[PDB]
Amino acid sequence: GSVKKLNDEVALERLKNERHVHDEEVELERLKNERHDHDY
**Cβ density class 6-36: b for 16+ within 10 Å, e for less:** eeeeeeeeeeeeeeeeeeeeeeeeeeeeeee
Q: Half-sphere exposure of residue 26, counting CA atoms within 13 Å on the CB side?
A: 6
Integer Cα distance of 12 and 36 in angstroms: 39
Length of the chain, please?
40
DSSP 4-39: --STHHHHHHHHHHHHHHHHHHHHHHHHHHTHHHHH
Q: Half-sphere exposure of residue 37, counting CA atoms within 13 Å on the CB side?
A: 6
Residue ranges making up the domain that contains 14: 1-40
Count of domains observed in the chain: 1
Determination technique for this PDB entry?
NMR
Side chain identity, residue 14:
R
